[PDB]
Symmetry: D2
Subunit: 392 residues, 4 copies
């Protein structure tokens, strides 16, 4: 008699490149589009939504509770509720776990959950109430400070990726080959229409003409191992991690519509899948990229699943270094991992990422008839999140 | 049977005045102290915490996931997890209901949940990626923009208070008499030592000497009706809402340690209460101060309680206009509400506030042997949140 | 026996467009090239220079006394002196008058005087010592605030141009025809090589390569009356003044090397002319564009010249409106004025402008054998400056 | 006969401490008050002024040509002119010399010349036109960058002071003794009323009551040798220069009214003195504090005076180390130098400083009946300025 919560529908924007397609688009506008889309896709009216839960890491200057702004712009009435949350990179997936819990505790019926992020729109900042009596001071890039800098050891996420490259003795070649394989899988899938279903177009409004954005613009077409092998290391001069074998800075949103299984049945909805389990676990901040290991093992143990049971896997590629380490420790078939590419190619809109890869997982699970699935993400400050999805 | 989760223990910092005692104290530092406090108070080792969940509305510049920074500074091991969330003024109490949900769904055994806020340390910000080829630009106060300003209508929270005052025909006098009652109640509680149990002293580390802060410094000593009636309207030149009958800008943190009833009994812990229900509902952002009315009613319905069963209430005083209005609608005995004073006196450290009033309720329920209690707050953008607590 | 001071030599950079050729070139670097050039042109060694005097309105952030920075870079000895000055648009010409005065009172023999300006490099700023306790504040564009905004009435110099347009009843048609004539005369002069003599090339050092700039890049080629006529008014929605009939925002330096007539004779130098007189007079800030009227009249009377004695004139074009009013009042033959075009086409690097038009005057006087010349500028805050030059 | 220019009258504000009395008072406000005062003291109407010349190193953000704002505020007519200039610390005295040249060349009859500075109001800046697509950037303190940092060697003026200390082998003790004597002489002069004649009171207007400032607030009362000796070196860790034996960061204005000797006689004015000579000379930037040596010597030679002919001297105290060096080299009787204290005590409002000390000299010469005086200052970037004054 345990609660069975399903994902009735999902959708994501395309992922924009840094200061690219969505250079001037507030996170909450991207969120509103995905919210309306999951509702239209499921045939559910906005007024039936109890609450919107949206992960977002970089809200500075966007005003009160951007999740609420997203919900209200999507047409979800004032009666519903909304809130944001921040488990950094895990945010978008975690939000789905959290939404599932609202329904499992009988506190709601229909949740919209996911994530949203405008890294482009993130401001610079300084604390100036006390004044600066004399001397220079720093205007601080909130994207870097609040999104990409380890709070404990003081270094960029890319150095934690170097720490993983040295513990696992991963060569520069092994990482450059992984990223080339990710770009090529993503270019293949995009041209074959495999992102069409999950992507809802977004209308960037302008003065000299609106623009429809429905293609992931951060993917690199014709990615040779040459353009990878010619890059300098970005975080250590005798290291292996580069702009080419790391993910980038990106804008996007993504969302899922959750309700009980019996509810989806009552509404004539064919659900994208059932949430069987989730799990988050901590690891050393220094090697934060390993997060997916204990989070996925725990998720799998809560499902009563073996690693071999899995038919599909979205394992977020923040860095090639961390991804290979995860694929090695866990030891699943790499041919079913990031089957349509991953974040090195597609982008990593921090708060949105977890709901982005969940989209890719669900829609590709429909495409090929995979029964069991698992999405998982490493997290700055040292954590992982994971979720097991079973098709119906 | 049903899960049953208890608040094993609770603690909060004093609430500091704006650019006051905590002027230069990062939110997570305040948060850390209160995490160590709830652990110590319950007799639980930090190594036993599965997850720290902390409300926070104004984290700009503090770096990656300040809940994880509070958790680590407090000595919760890297293996645990941590996140922040934002349901604005409701964040601190919502984090507690979220934590309870973690335990009810079987995903955790032991949560620290609460909130934290340094409104003092909130930076001014500006989006400057595109560059500013010519012309003045605004450095935006994130405290005002992201905390205090309604996103839909463009005006401060105090203006929603004017809308509520007007709806309910609340005179200036009546708002002012409420504010004085609240100050006089709070100065009394302070003097008679009724804040001591709940407060854990925070030590401010400076160059010139450590300062231990263990007293709410926002409370005005010897407040009079005469003093209030001298003040000018702060939001409307023929309005009723002043600085004297509105809460303030404040710094502080507050948390609670949650576990199952059965686990408290295993550990010999005598908990502060059982979380019997909670609820959140939405309303017109224009009159967000009415949030607590449907929130408290839904919460009481979920608990199976009538309003007269309540023995003690903490209904947050964002503004006298809204506080009076909520009290007149629900009809609870004003004498069991904010019995040691409310936020006009004590302060409103946004993200911490909901855990702040929860602390006050729990320790006063204990000291007078109350059995049934409710905490509730209005939420900017048009929401309310409430929680019902029963003593063991 | 009244002292006679000559201009032995002169030089100017090309005038750069706003954030264009000299986008990242500090004013002092442009100044240094022009100091070296006037020395080279006169056959005078840097070791012989007593003082360098440079007009400069927007030095913020450039460091201590950019005039000294310029002169040291050009190898003027540490035993010499250097200072900057600021009479706004008048500065580069006032500098020369002041340098002439050093020699006249016997305090110096050899002066390099002019001005320099990098409007591109001008920063944004805020008084932040006292703090901003709460609320937004402005980051102020120093170029606009200290350069282009009237300090009394608070509006841009364009509005003073509107005031002049109304008071002199100057049509949009007349102003635009003037603007097009300036563009077309400057393009002709450019293509014929008439700026070559005065322009010294400036090498913009980069990383991917050095670029030699020796063309005035703000000059529009093939400028049409239609392109002027289609612009909207820039300062008053029912006005006549536009971006097209106003000058621009620009970068440049320019200078003159001064000595007594007898010293030039001793050296065998053929000077560019003798400074027979100068003057500066104030007018109403509201119609500051009129400055050249009383200044030119005073300069001429000090020279004992009638207006009809002039063979050539450089009257600076801050705005078509004021250029037209000045020509109307003075009544000098427009065909002898801004013969090679003016600032509408060439640009207006504020602190340099006055020495820029002096350069154009002097080299045209030489080229055509004009005997008597005058340069004059209008000045924000309501002033004018004029200088009479006679050929030797 | 030669042109003889006299100082008819003089006045200065008190010198305010950094973020002290004048923390929020724009320099031009201070200037306006001293302009009005020199007019009143001379019995000359504002309508009679031809030009205002005001030294000012740090005008960023104050708007167009603060000299003109100052002159207009004092009711100097729109028909007059005004300009600012910058020879750093020498500026306030150089303006006077420049003012004298306007009259000697017959270009003006009546000049108000001096300087003004608000180091408190100096802003922080950043060049932001190109944008900062990613990363932290610096907000630069303009007071330090444009006022106090050497542009060639990149270090503060205090480092130049160390270089002079080492070269002249000046002990810590000798420097501190000098500093203590400056404080103690200034304090005696203050108590005895010796600054009253030269100071014009300034009214600081504020919402909560006007404050009249007529005392130099930087002067330390009861300054002890021990208070100096305890300090740590501020620039070199085995240096000798400290906050105590250097001057401060200060706000002030000061000026003089000039006219020919014959015009003063026509008007029946008894002048404060005749300007007999002035000089400016350069020195190595690295030892800029030595500027007063070649400059004083040149001024004296130009006057036909031996050093021993001087009855009184104001040699500016940028730093004890340099003031000591200057006095050692010149060898004048130290008992006639800075007779009422100097800038270590009184403060150093850069652009005003040279006119400030001139005020002190003039009024002491008058009060004790000294016939021959000299004022002189060192100048960052390696210069000196000096002026010889004789009583009539
Ligand atoms: C005083 C002087 O420098 O002479 C005239 C200077 N003219 C200008 O600076 C106008 C340049 N204008 C432009 O580039 C566009 O018309 C503008 C609308 C972008 C300018 O914007 C403004 O309104 C200013 C006055 C703030 C520059
Ligand atoms: C030429 C000149 O500058 O005159 C002397 C004025 N004094 C100063 O510039 C130094 C003022 N110094 C101080 O208040 C303290 O020494 C300080 C160490 C706190 C200043 O901090 C600094 O390092 C600088 C940049 C101001 C020198």
């Amino acid at each position: 008699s345990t609660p069975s919560i399903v994902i009735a529908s999902a959708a994501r924007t395309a992922v924009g490149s840094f200061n690219g397609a969505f250079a001037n688009t507030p996170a909450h506008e991207l969120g509103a589009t995905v919210i309306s889309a999951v509702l239209e896709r499921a045939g559910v009216a906005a007024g039936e939504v109890n609450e919107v839960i949206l992960g977002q890491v970089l809200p500075a200057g966007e005003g009160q509770n951007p999740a609420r702004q997203a919900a209200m712009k999507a047409g979800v009435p004032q009666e519903a509720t909304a809130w944001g949350m921040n488990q950094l990179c895990g945010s978008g997936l975690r939000a789905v776990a959290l939404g599932m819990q609202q329904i499992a505790t009988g506190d709601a019926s229909i949740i919209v959950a996911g994530g949203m992020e405008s890294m482009s729109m993130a401001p610079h900042c300084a604390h100036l109430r006390g004044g600066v009596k004399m001397g220079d001071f720093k205007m601080i890039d909130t994207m870097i400070k609040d999104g990409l800098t380890d709070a404990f050891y003081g270094y960029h996420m890319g150095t934690t990726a170097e720490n993983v490259a040295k513990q696992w003795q991963l060569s520069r070649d092994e990482q450059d080959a992984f990223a080339v394989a990710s770009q090529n899988k993503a270019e293949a899938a995009q041209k074959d229409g495999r992102f069409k279903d999950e992507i809802v177009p977004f209308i960037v409004k302008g003065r000299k003409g609106d623009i429809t954005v429905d293609a992931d613009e951060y993917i690199r077409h014709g990615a040779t191992l040459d353009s990878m092998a010619k890059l300098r290391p970005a975080f250590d001069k005798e290291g292996t991690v580069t702009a080419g074998n790391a993910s980038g800075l990106n804008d996007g949103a993504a969302a899922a519509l959750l309700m009980s299984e019996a509810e989806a049945s009552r509404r004539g909805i064919q659900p994208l899948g059932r949430i069987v389990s989730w799990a988050t676990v901590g690891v050393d901040p220094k090697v934060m990229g390993t997060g997916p290991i204990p989070a996925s093992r725990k998720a799998l143990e809560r499902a009563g699943w073996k690693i071999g049971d899995l038919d599909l896997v979205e394992a977020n590629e923040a860095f090639a270094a961390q991804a290979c380490a995860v694929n090695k420790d866990l030891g699943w078939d790499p041919s079913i991992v990031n089957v349509n590419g991953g974040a090195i190619a597609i982008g990593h809109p921090i708060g949105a990422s977890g709901a982005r890869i969940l989209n890719t997982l669900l829609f590709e699970m429909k495409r090929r008839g995979a029964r069991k699935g698992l999405a998982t993400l490493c997290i700055g400050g040292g954590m992982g999140v994971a979720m097991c999805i079973e098709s119906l």
